[PDB]
């Protein structure tokens, strides 16, 4: 049900620019065939709601074969097609297109001559466009067919960016000690690693221009012509360019466009604002955004001195290299780190201001003879604790991979004999794991790799409860407490991904709305969704409010904690959602927020996902929220009152 509830179908239906341009392209394509005195037979691969096939019949198509692999959506399409009056000219086929056949016992009577698809993701080819088009041309469509879109072009732009490069590399981490400044350096293999072999998809329009320096023009790397045989074979494309500035080549930004017609008059583009002529004409969507790729190593370029950028791809994946000045399987992570820390986590560890804030917290609670246990996955806190004068430091790493990575970091920093790594689930550690000692300081960020919602990091509190018997009398916990906070917001655009459409370009899509509604209301309580709100502008309509408080210095209570209240809407706007986040009381006079950092538009901690509870799809919002200690779940309802 959750796959349906949080699918991208609703966003597509609200994507006005997408739907307008497809409709224009489809009318032109169908007319080109009819004007030749020929039968117009449409193959619509990945039909979803059936929208593009319905467009095709209004344009004059004789018949459409609409293919949809996902059974619940194929069933929806059948109903939607019927509601809109097109059942006589559209056959919905619930198969993957590569299983579709032409023949007396087949799905199609003959090859089609108009090929419509919307099989694209942010990387263009990451959801199988190439092998799908390849098979279609081989078996399902005529030579010289019309295609909508007619072609796609992938673009790339080389930049220097400390912020985005910090999602890929570990920078030196500084800490001030009694003896002076200490530095934590990365293992050399991290410095030499090509990184994780996966795109980083983001709303690139929300990255400040101050965060990167453009080093190249926007380069058209390669194009795919959907009207002719498409190949899914590996390929590489080398494009020469003259650097626009001197700097460190680090990051390749990328996006694509599609042309709906042979003449290229009708275009949809994912280019970010600085690569378009007018930011006021920018079109928002979420189902397609932009790409961030990393070069396998950084290196200098010089303004005016030509180089060649190379786009590599296989049947699903794209990656980049900078050709040698003189002068292929995709490289994989050989340093462990990129398999364990995701891109935002890299950025978080590299936030020196954040690190300094934890350092000052530790200075406050690090008493003489402190015996520290550190609990948080892949955390550098154990190293800060040592450098700041802990008598003995233990840390827990519950996976063998993370255990090895942290030991490696400790060893290259000559701390192998100062920090003991315990390879167990933290709640299961033993007296002997602590060498028979009692813990006087239990510390954490808290951060755990598996946490998906902000309150999942309350696992730290669970661990605190489980290891109580290993704590010294008067033991201190850092953070000493945590709290759940909420604010009501109006989203600029994000509301589109969960709002009903009703009518799309004249077609009745209420059945799609009903289907989504049924899935997100399956449970008695609707769940909040995690989103990185630094990528999604919104403004507050209420004051922020503390919802629940958790005293880490004490064990978790065995009864559920419930809170009820009201949040006054103090500013005008549409109440799209309640946004929730965690704050941590590190010490009596130190706090940190993983959500709102300007309690204009909201400003959000860029390292963390916030939780969004969308409201029913009016100047007070009431809430009921409950924390369940057996599971760690938090259930909630927010409603206008
Ligand atoms: N090779 C394939 N054969 C059949 N369905 C496919 C497919 N590849 C992807 N899909 C389906 O293609 C759809 C892509 S979303 C596009 C939906 C629709 N054409 C529209 O534009 O409104 C999804 O529902 C997915 O399940
Ligand atoms: C769900 N638990 C059993 C722990 C499991 C968390 S894990 O996914 O990090 O393994 C109980 C729990 C209890 C209180 C807080 C948080 C979790
Ligand atoms: Zn790596």
Keywords:
monomer; 641 residues; alpha+beta; Rossmann fold; Hnrnp arginine n-methyltransferase1; 7-stranded antiparallel β-sheet; 15 helices; 34 strands; 21% helix; binds S-adenosyl-L-homocysteine; binds 3-[benzyl(dimethyl)ammonio]propane-1-sulfonate; binds zinc ion; nucleus; ribonucleoprotein complex binding; PRMT_dom
- The tally of structural domains comes to 4
Structural class: alpha+beta
Instruction: Tell me the CATH architecture of the largest domain.
Output: Distorted Sandwich
Oligomeric organization of the protein chains? monomer
Bound molecules: S-adenosyl-L-homocysteine, 3-[benzyl(dimethyl)ammonio]propane-1-sulfonate, zinc ion
Largest sheet: 7 strands, antiparallel
Give the end-to-end Cα distance, rounded to a whole number of Å. 29 Å
PDB class: transferase
Keywords: transferase
Assembly: monomeric
Entry title: Crystal structure of mouse protein arginine methyltransferase 7 in complex with SAH
């Amino acid at each position: 049900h959750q796959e349906i509830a949080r699918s991208s179908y609703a966003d597509m239906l609200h994507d006005k620019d997408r739907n307008i341009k497809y409709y224009q392209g489809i009318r032109a394509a169908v007319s080109r065939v009819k004007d030749r005195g020929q039968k117009a037979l449409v193959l619509d691969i990945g039909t979803g709601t059936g929208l593009l096939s319905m467009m095709a019949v209004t344009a004059g198509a004789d018949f459409c074969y609409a293919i949809e692999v996902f059974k619940p959506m194929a069933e929806a399409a059948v109903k939607i097609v019927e509601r809109n009056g097109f059942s006589d000219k559209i056959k919905v086929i619930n198969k993957h297109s590569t299983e579709v056949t032409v023949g007396p016992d087949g799905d199609l009577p003959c090859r089609a001559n108009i090929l419509i698809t919307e099989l694209f993701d942010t990387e263009l080819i990451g959801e199988g466009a190439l092998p799908s088009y390849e098979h279609a041309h081989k078996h399902l469509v005529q030579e010289d067919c019309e295609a909508v879109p007619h072609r796609a072009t992938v673009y790339a732009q080389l930049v220097e960016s400390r912020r985005m490069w910090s999602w890929n590399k570990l920078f030196p981490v500084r800490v001030r000690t009694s003896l002076g400044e200490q530095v934590i350096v990365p293992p050399s293999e991290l410095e030499r690693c090509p990184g994780a072999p996966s795109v980083c998809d983001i709303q690139l329009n929300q990255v400040s221009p101050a965060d990167f320096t453009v080093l190249s023009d926007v380069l058209p790397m390669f194009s795919v012509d959907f009207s002719k045989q498409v190949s899914s074979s590996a390929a590489c494309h080398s494009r020469q360019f003259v650097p626009l500035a001197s700097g460190q080549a680090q990051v390749v930004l990328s996006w694509w466009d599609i042309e709906m017609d042979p003449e290229g008059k009708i275009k949809c583009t994912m280019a970010p604002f600085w690569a378009q002529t007018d930011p006021q004409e920018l079109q928002w969507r979420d189902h397609w955004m932009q790409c961030v790729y990393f070069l396998p190593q950084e290196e200098p370029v010089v303004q005016g001195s030509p180089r060649c950028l190379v786009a590599h791809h296989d049947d699903y994946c794209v990656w980049y290299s900078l050709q040698r000045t003189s002068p292929q399987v995709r490289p994989v992570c050989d340093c462990q780190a990129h398999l364990l820390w995701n891109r935002p986590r890299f950025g978080e560890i590299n936030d020196q201001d954040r690190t300094d804030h934890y350092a000052q917290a530790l200075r406050t609670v690090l008493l003489p003879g402190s015996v520290c246990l550190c609990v948080s996955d892949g955390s550098l806190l154990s190293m800060l604790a040592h450098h700041l004068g802990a008598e003995q430091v233990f840390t827990v790493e519950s996976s063998v991979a993370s255990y090895r990575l942290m030991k490696r970091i400790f060893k290259v920093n000559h701390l192998e004999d100062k920090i003991s790594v315990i390879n167990k689930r933290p709640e299961l550690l033993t007296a002997a794991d602590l060498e028979g000692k009692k813990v006087s300081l239990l510390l954490g960020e808290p951060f755990f790799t598996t946490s998906l919602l902000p309150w999942h990091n309350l696992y730290f509190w669970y661990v605190r409860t489980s290891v109580d018997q290993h704590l010294a009398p008067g033991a201190v916990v850092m953070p000493q407490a945590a709290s759940l906070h909420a604010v009501i917001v109006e989203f600029r655009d994000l509301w589109r991904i969960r709002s009903p459409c009703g009518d799309c370009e004249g077609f009745d899509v209420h059945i799609m709305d009903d289907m989504i509604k049924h899935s997100l209301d399956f449970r008695e309580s609707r769940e909040a969704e995690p989103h990185p709100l630094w990528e999604y502008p919104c403004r507050s309509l209420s004051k922020p409010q503390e919802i629940l408080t958790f005293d880490f210095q004490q064990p978790i209570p065995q009864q559920p904690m419930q809170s009820k209240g009201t949040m006054e809407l103090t500013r005008p706007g549409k109440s799209h959602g309640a946004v929730l986040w965690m704050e941590y009381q590190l010490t009596p006079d130190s706090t940190i927020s993983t959500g709102l950092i300007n309690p204009g538009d909201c400003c959000w901690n860029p390292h963390c996902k916030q939780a969004v509870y969308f409201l029913s799809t009016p100047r007070s919002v009431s809430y009921v929220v409950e924390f369940h200690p057996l599971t760690g779940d938090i259930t909630m309802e927010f409603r206008l009152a």
